[PDB]
Amino acid sequence: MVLSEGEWQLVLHVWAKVEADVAGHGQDIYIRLFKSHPETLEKFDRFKHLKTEAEMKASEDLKKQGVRVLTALGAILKKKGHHEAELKPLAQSHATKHKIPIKYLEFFSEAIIHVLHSRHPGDFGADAQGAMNKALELFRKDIAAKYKELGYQG
Ligand code: HEM
Ligand SMILES: [Xe]
Ligand SMILES: [Xe]
Ligand SMILES: [Xe]
């Protein structure tokens, strides 16, 4: 699969808004993920103790984690599909250390889309959401292929 330049521009234009406050967006995305799919929280040794949205919002380490994750994803999106080098260390760590199944990456993608739809109706109409879906699908497809090379069915 290949996104058009126009599709990449829809992705990058909503990402520009995320970058006004990446920390706030990261909190919202993690909170949505953990509420919609509580099982995902179990993968985080450092965060699995958090009991409520209030506790999640108050967690400085969770905030920092959200910034790290969204910055790494942003770097990937800015490559517009040319992300082989960026994907290698992520695929290895998530396959082998963190043990994150592709289904959890799907849940995370769903959380991103939900938050962008909520926060950014001005840059996340139907065409833009379709472009972001395509970009995240591409990312997951490429991660899944690397998972397989790395010896992880996940
Ligand atoms: C776009 C998708 C994702 C990106 C770009 C991403 C990125 C990152 C980065 C950059 C790190 C720190 C470096 C590393 O260990 O590789 C990390 C750590 C981690 N990731 Fe992900 N991640 C994604 C999805 C997920 C999902 C869906 C889960 C679980 C449901 C997950 C679980 C973890 C865990 C448990 C750590 C270690 C956290 C800690 O240090 O406390 N990741 N991720
Ligand atoms: Xe996040
Ligand atoms: Xe990942
Ligand atoms: Xe993703």
Side-chain angles (χ1 to χ4, degrees), residues 87-145:
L87 253 52
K88 278 171 63 174
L90 278 173
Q92 185 176 37
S93 67
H94 289 67
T96 313
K97 181 181 182 174
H98 311 310
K99 298 171 170 197
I100 308 308
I102 294 302
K103 195 224 135 165
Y104 286 13
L105 297 182
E106 291 171 356
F107 297 160
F108 191 61
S109 298
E110 179 182 72
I112 291 168
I113 287 168
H114 178 90
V115 171
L116 294 185
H117 170 87
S118 290
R119 283 185 170 243
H120 295 296
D123 292 279
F124 210 69
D127 287 349
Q129 179 170 331
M132 180 63 73
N133 176 52
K134 194 166 174 173
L136 298 175
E137 186 172 311
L138 171 64
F139 167 79
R140 296 194 310 272
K141 179 181 111 295
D142 288 356
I143 287 289

Side-chain angles (χ1 to χ4, degrees), residues 1 41-42 46 52 57 70 72 82-83 89 137 143 150:
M1 64 192 288
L41 180 56
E42 302 180 41
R46 285 164 75 243
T52 64
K57 184 69 171 169
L70 295 187
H82 291 97
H83 51 224
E137 186 172 311
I143 287 289
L150 291 160

Side-chain angles (χ1 to χ4, degrees), residues 4-138:
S4 69
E5 174 65 7
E7 286 166 340
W8 285 118
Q9 288 303 325
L10 293 174
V11 170
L12 295 174
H13 281 254
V14 74
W15 212 257
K17 306 306 166 191
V18 173
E19 289 178 335
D21 173 22
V22 64
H25 286 76
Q27 290 173 307
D28 280 7
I29 292 164
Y30 268 138
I31 289 166
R32 174 68 183 182
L33 179 63
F34 296 152
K35 295 196 308 193
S36 291
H37 309 277
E39 68 268 31
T40 61
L41 180 56
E42 302 180 41
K43 291 287 178 178
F44 293 87
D45 306 348
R46 285 164 75 243
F47 309 128
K48 64 182 175 184
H49 69 285
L50 303 165
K51 296 186 179 289
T52 64
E53 173 167 3
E55 290 189 353
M56 293 168 192
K57 184 69 171 169
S59 175
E60 294 189 312
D61 293 341
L62 188 59
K63 185 175 127 197
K64 285 172 185 188
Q65 169 65 15
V67 170
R68 196 168 170 17
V69 174
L70 295 187
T71 300
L73 182 56
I76 285 157
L77 298 172
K78 290 169 188 187
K79 289 299 185 83
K80 305 194 290 194
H82 291 97
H83 51 224
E84 165 63 8
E86 287 80 8
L87 253 52
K88 278 171 63 174
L90 278 173
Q92 185 176 37
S93 67
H94 289 67
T96 313
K97 181 181 182 174
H98 311 310
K99 298 171 170 197
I100 308 308
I102 294 302
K103 195 224 135 165
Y104 286 13
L105 297 182
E106 291 171 356
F107 297 160
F108 191 61
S109 298
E110 179 182 72
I112 291 168
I113 287 168
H114 178 90
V115 171
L116 294 185
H117 170 87
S118 290
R119 283 185 170 243
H120 295 296
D123 292 279
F124 210 69
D127 287 349
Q129 179 170 331
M132 180 63 73
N133 176 52
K134 194 166 174 173
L136 298 175
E137 186 172 311
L138 171 64

